[PDB]
Each structure stands twice: as C-alpha cells, then as structure tokens.
C-alpha cells in the first residue's frame, strides 16, 4: 500500500499539515485503548503512531514510561498488540499506522517474521527507536520487502552525510527530532529546524513530521509554517489518559477536545 503517500498528497491539496498522535497500545487496557484510538481518529488524527509495551523504553521520558507500565499491569503482550492492530485496520482503511518499537521486540523471533506480521495486519511504518542508521540495514531491508516504510530519525544537528542517508533510506515520513533528550511534553524544542527541512526536500526525503515536546496548537502551526508536513504529539496525549484513569468517559471527552484543537491548528 501507499497510505502515507496518499495522505500527504490529499493534505497538500487542502494545504493542511498532518496531526499525528502517539499512544501506547493497551494503555490502560485493551478495550479502553481501542476506544481511545477510535476517538483520536474521529476527532481528526491524520495518522497514528502506536507503541508496543516494552520492558526498557530508553528513548521515553516518565509519561511514556508510565504508559508502558500501565499496559503491562493489564497483562498486554506483543501478540495482543498485533490483534489490536488488525482490528484497527479493519475499521479504518486509509489512515497510516506507524509503530514505535524497540529493537529486541523486532529481532526476538526474527526480523523478517516481525515485518511479515506487520504487513499481515496492515501497518504502514515502523520506527525502531534504538537502531541508528548505522545499524539499520537488516531492519530497512525487511521493512521494504514487506511493504513497510522504515522511519528514520533526523536529529536537529544532523550533518550533510546523515541527511543524505535519512533521505535515501527512509520512506513514508522523515522523523524530525525537535531536540536532544527523550520524549516528554515538559521540554519544548528550541532549535530552528527550517534549514534541515529545506535540505531534506532537496534530497527528496520522505515528508518531515516534527516530534518530541509538541504539546500545544501553536507548536503544530509553527511546524507547518517552518516547512514540515506535520507534527507528532505523544506525552501530551498520554498525560490526558494518565489524568483521567478514574473516568473513562471524561478521558475520551478530553482526548477529543485536545485532538480537535491540535488538528485545527494544522489547517492554518
């Protein structure tokens, strides 16, 4: 499939940016997570980034560390996550679905078999957080053999050689890191990324999505204004889950409001 290509073409036609939420699959449980995800889409999410609970999420700050822990407290396994992913795709045919993985979960039972499973359930991309471009060859090869986009990270200080590598090897979208450090809404990226965005376009990279620390509408509008195709927000979404564990109904209402506002900021 070409779900990212089709989304970005449609968004270009509307001169809109993409708004892409992240959540952990199965946080705070399987049924509520499926409802959360349906809410995100109904409220305006253009694509999804979905984490499989992992014991050692070393690129994540406390908010997402705690999301992983809630899913484990509910007994969530990678197999159950793949069941979830099949159902999400069965409900929603065109939305791009990306996974956020750590290397061991991909390598565990064989790299090729992991990507074949992704293809079977209808995933569109995989970002492996602890595999740099230097170690990417067997992951990117397996991804492409199975019609999965391998997502590469472009750090805010990427040199020319790295930009060229990310542009060549990546598909779907290019992940434009806001800053150093780990995920979290408490730290906002304060480096101008417009020069990276321009150099990526020069090298015909996959369209850029800015992520890390995006928690407000003005940041989404700013990402689009700088030349990015859109923005990803994780901790801010997960915070609403964490805040509202005691009230599943109010949790969905608050998620809807947030996503709606963030998506609105993407239109202009």
């Amino acid at each position: 499939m070409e779900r990212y290509e089709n989304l970005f073409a449609q968004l270009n036609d509307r001169r809109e940016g993409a708004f892409v939420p992240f959540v952990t699959l199965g946080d705070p449980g399987i049924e509520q997570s499926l409802k959360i995800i349906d809410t995100l889409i109904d409220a305006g999410a253009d694509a999804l980034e979905l984490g499989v609970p992992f014991s050692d999420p070393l690129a994540d700050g406390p908010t997402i560390q705690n999301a992983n822990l809630r899913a484990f407290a509910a007994g969530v396994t990678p197999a159950q996550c793949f069941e979830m992913l099949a159902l999400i795709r069965e409900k929603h045919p065109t939305i791009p679905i990306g996974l956020l993985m750590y290397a061991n979960l991909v390598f565990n039972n064989g790299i090729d078999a992991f990507y074949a499973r992704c293809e079977q359930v209808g995933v569109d991309s995989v970002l492996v957080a602890d595999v740099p471009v230097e170690e990417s060859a067997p992951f990117r090869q397996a991804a492409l053999r199975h019609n999965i986009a391998p997502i590469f990270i472009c750090p805010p200080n990427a040199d020319d050689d790295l930009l060229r590598q990310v542009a060549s090897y990546g598909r779907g979208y290019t992940y434009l890191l806001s800053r150093s450090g780990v995920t979290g809404a408490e730290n906002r990226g304060a480096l101008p990324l417009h020069h990276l965005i321009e150099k990526l376009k020069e090298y015909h990279a996959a369209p850029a999505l800015q992520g890390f620390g995006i928690s407000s509408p003005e940041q989404v509008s700013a990402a689009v204004r700088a030349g990015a195709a859109g923005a990803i927000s994780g901790s801010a979404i997960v915070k609403i889950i964490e805040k509202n564990l005691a009230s599943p109904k109010q949790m969905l209402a608050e998620l809807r409001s947030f996503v709606s506002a963030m998506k609105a900021a993407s239109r202009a």
Partner: protein, 394 residues
Amino acid sequence: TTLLNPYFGEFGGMYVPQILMPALNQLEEAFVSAQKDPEFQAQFADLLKNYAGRPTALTKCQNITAGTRTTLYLKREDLLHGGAHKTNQVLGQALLAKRMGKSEIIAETGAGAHGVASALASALLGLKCRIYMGAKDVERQSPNVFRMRLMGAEVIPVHSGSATLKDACNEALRDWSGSYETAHYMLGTAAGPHPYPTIVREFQRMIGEETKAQILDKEGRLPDAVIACVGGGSNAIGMFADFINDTSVGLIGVEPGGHGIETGEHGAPLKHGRVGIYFGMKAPMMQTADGQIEESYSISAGLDFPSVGPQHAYLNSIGRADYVSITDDEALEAFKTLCRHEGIIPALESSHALAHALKMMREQPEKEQLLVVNLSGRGDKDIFTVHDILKARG
C-alpha cells in the same frame, strides 16, 4: 562510520537512539587518541600505581591444594583501592572524560560497587558525579549509598520498570541523551554499545599483563588456565586479554548459576540465555519468550547483569574461551574454604571463580595443572549475607 570495529563477530554494535551516535563517535575518537598519547598513559599509570596501589599481588595458595597436583595462584584485585578491580577502568574513563573537556560524570550501579568506584574517581579528579541506582537496590545497599554521598556524589533512585540495574542503565542513557555535551557516561562493565566493550577491556588489561609477568617470574611458564567470574565481563576480559594469543592458556569464565540452571533462577545468559538487542548491543541475554528483558539472579548482587559483554559471546562462539556456571551453594563453600585455609575473605562474586577452580582440582586431583583465579574483590561486604544464610541453614 567508526575508527574501530564495533563488532566481535556477530556480537556487539551500537544500538542506541540516533541522538547518541555523536557521543559514541566522540568517545571512540578520544580513546583512540589517548591510547597513542604517552602523557595520557603516564597519567593513567601514575594514578594506578600511587593512588590505587598497582601492581597487585599474586598469591600462591598452598593449603587449599595440598595433596593434589593443582598449583593455584590468586590475582589479588581484592587489594586494589576500593577493594575491587572496578577502580582500574573508572580511573581511565575519568581521564577520558577530562580529555574531552567534560566536567560531569553519569554512572549506573546495582549493588553499588561501580557507584562507589565512580564517586571516588570523581572526587579525586574534580568531576561532578551523579549515579543512577534502582530504587530496590538503594533500599538494600545503604552502606554503598552512604559512601557515594560521603564522596560528594548525587545518588538518584530509579523507580521505572523493575527498579533494579537494567532500569538504572536505562536512566543513565536517557540522561546522557540530553547531557552528552558536558557529561561523560561512565559505564560499569565490558558491555553496552561500542566503544565501551573495547575501552573497558583496554583499561582492565593490566590484570592479565601483570599476571603473565608474575607467573613467568614464579613458575617459569604460562598458566594452564585463567579463571574469572562473569557479571558483565570486565574483570574476566581484563584477565583474559593478554593471554588471548597464547593458545595454550585456557580462558574460563564463570557465570552465576543461582539456585540452579534448571530452576531458571540464575544469571548465566551466555550459556543459557538467548541472543537479543538491548543496552546498546547484540548479545546473549535473560529475556522472556516474547522478548521482554528479565533479571539475573545470584546470591552475589555484583553478578546481576542480565546480559554479558559481546567479546565473551564471541570468544565462546569460536571456542577460544569456555564458560561454565557455579551455584549459590558452591560459591558459599568456596568463600568459607578460602577464609579458613588461606586467611583471605573473597567477594562472593570472586567466590564463583574460586569454586570452579576447586572443582577442577577435586574432580581430577592427580591432573597436573597450574591455575590462576582472578580474585576480583574482597568479601567484607558479604559477611552479613553469609551470616544470614549460615544461620538460617543452621
């Protein structure tokens, strides 16, 4: 691209987030430069000699081998400042930090031995030190925690995941991901992403260099085998390195067998785990069927690393080194034996290496063999642990 090979055969690599790759490349460059720099070498030698007390003794243990054809020496890393071999590589990493113009140190610790070693080196050399320690380890290693604080280090409890060593390893890497411009991550074993396995080996190799010189002086020949316990692999690779090209010398690494391999409650991933990717490396590790990282169990808290350095996995694969396991009960017997017959209290970590040597002797008492055990640390810290078992046992 790198200056040095990040792999030992299939094992090792640099499995870190992209943001950390410049940090690893900078460290590798600084290390390669330092290794060519006579001034760096002289500063390191000075600290090792005048501060840490190298060379360490090689003790012939005549009482424990009486009536057999085994000759047993102990390489006395227990006599190094701090009472364990970890001091060697912390001093060298602290000098690398300085070389790069860094003024801050981050370290992980489980039982606390690496935390104390990091704090002492930082005190001596004027670096500000912060140490991550799993909340569960903090609660149970009060003495080490107090030492780190006495030495001016900040100790930061980690409550995420399982609140033990692997979680402290994660927290150190998270911190470094945001602070690498000013802080050096002082990794505590011969594991993690390149260039750490290589650097830690090179900054521990004086163990084996000294052992070789000492055994040639005292016996006129090389050992038949050198035997070392394996947590993450630093003391063992430190002993093994200078003998790798001496094909006649056996290299035996001893993983903790805990309650018994069959029980699942052990810390022997090299022989009884599965290859995975975690903590920056491709290596055998303790993991569930679906790939979640698990804990290592041992009576000895210092053998709690749930994986093993990639060079050990490599040396095993090619048959250059052999790896075995020793149970809690075997380690405890070796501890008691050394105390009573040689007047040395060994670390329970080191007791695993001694236990295997004692087995080599006892199983085949008329086999002529010259053995060296790396006595990686002293066992003062372990007397309460041993107290509690010997009492509950009767």
